[PDB]
Amino acid sequence: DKTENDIKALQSIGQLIGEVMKELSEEKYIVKASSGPRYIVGVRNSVDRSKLKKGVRVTLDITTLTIMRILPRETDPLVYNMTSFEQGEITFDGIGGLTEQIRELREVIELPLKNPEKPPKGVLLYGPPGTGKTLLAKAVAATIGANFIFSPASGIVDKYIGESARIIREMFAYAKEHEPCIIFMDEVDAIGGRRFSEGTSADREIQRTLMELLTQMDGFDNLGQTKIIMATNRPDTLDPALLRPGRLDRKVEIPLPNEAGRLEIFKIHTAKVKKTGEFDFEAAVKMSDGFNGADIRNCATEAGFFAIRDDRDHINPDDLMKAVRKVAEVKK
Amino acid sequence: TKETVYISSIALLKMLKHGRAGVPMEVMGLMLGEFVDDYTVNVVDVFAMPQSGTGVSVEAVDDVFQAKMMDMLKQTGRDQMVVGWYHSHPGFGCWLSSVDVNTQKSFEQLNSRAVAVVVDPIQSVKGKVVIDAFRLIDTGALINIQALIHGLNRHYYSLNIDYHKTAKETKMLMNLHYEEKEESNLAATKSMVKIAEQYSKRIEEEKELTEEELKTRVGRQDPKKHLSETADETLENNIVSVLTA
């Protein structure tokens, strides 16, 4: 049967695709061939001339040249150009010691979703990444229920017009379709921000993106359940018009974990790695100086070497304070 | 030379169905019929070779399944001569393949003569048919003659197709369109639902015409043209409804 199914599946044949370049009339479609040029085509059947619209992904006919099926679109490498992840890895707390942005963001992000009574326009992360900063965005995403969608910067502007928008508007399209969706626009001075001279470097492609979001944000595209986490290390590298409400409702400092900020993150990010009680908890934290949430984990992990090296899966004080010094040797 | 091909439209449509869906492939398989005296290419039937994942070839022909059928067909009482070759040639007026020829040519051997039926299943669907059958050589001719004895006969060289069925299926065909009473009067007495449109449609006619008439003050759009064809289309369709009431 299985092979027979295949044996049968071979009867079955491939089916042309288009995304409607437009609907002239309910039936009448310009669908530029998703493989090729524009065509005057009709519906076929199981066809909702309703759903049928410009851009609507559709299976098309080799002969009848019309709909062989209506198709759910993916217009954009939703995991590549767009990058989508449902919620986030950790909730707020593990990077605790960043706690300032643990709470305050959630009440300006997660709650006003569940508390639609403005909707948040944007939320701008800045400060050192990977202090839990890297984790903060997903901490936001985790608690909400949204799909976290990572947006890198440079790649969204291809040298062409609206590729940005196209990439971005699928971040609008898919996500607002896939909502709730966290959008996360990664450290964006490339396709956004204040550009080069604000002249043309392709800056006009960049201004586009800058304006695309603007036309999405200061444009009437809202974030209903699809939320957008802005990313930068420093906020001032960005469009001030972006910094305005209607685009940015939040501008997020993300400092280092404090000593206790480390200590909390420490016994979170480190002590969760298999460790002794002998593993020297605060002396690490004390030897921990300005360690980010990861550089905290380095207290664990740089000692995971010495764990591995002391023949430990369980980090030991010997493992540990070698690490935390090692984590505090190369930096503060 | 003027040669009489005869098709079972069954086999015709059978092929079509097979051919219509056959795109891309040229559909392949038997051609069941005979030759009544000369000229006479009869077709009762035909059938798919099963898909050729090797595509149409002199090779991809399997005479197993035919016999299987032909037996079951013989069992069916179904029996004919395999009269030639019919395939689905997307966007092909042209000619099918010298292969297909050679394919046939290998095969028309098995007959006095055979065909290779050109079909563009694409161009078939047009509401008219697109099709041909080659068998490229003659006896002499309608007896053409010279190029054979002079050797080097190659060309399209169609045959002359025809077919016949009956008034029988014709009915059963024209049966296309309890019944009428249920099917007709009364079944489309729905009008009044649209009276507004039926008005408005008629309403719109009016304007178009003051317009049209006006130009009287060259070539078509002419002041006294679409007028009738317009106010004449809403006249009847509006009278048929009266039959119901």
Partner: peptide, 28 residues
């Protein structure tokens, strides 16, 4: 019958509903 040619044009999947796939050729 079926197999194979040297080579085919290859293509890249989108959907994998559960039985559904679209691909776009090495002929695009």
């Amino acid at each position: 019958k079926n197999n194979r040619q040297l080579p085919y044009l290859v293509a890249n999947v989108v959907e994998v509903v559960g039985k559904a796939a679209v691909v776009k050729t090495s002929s695009r």
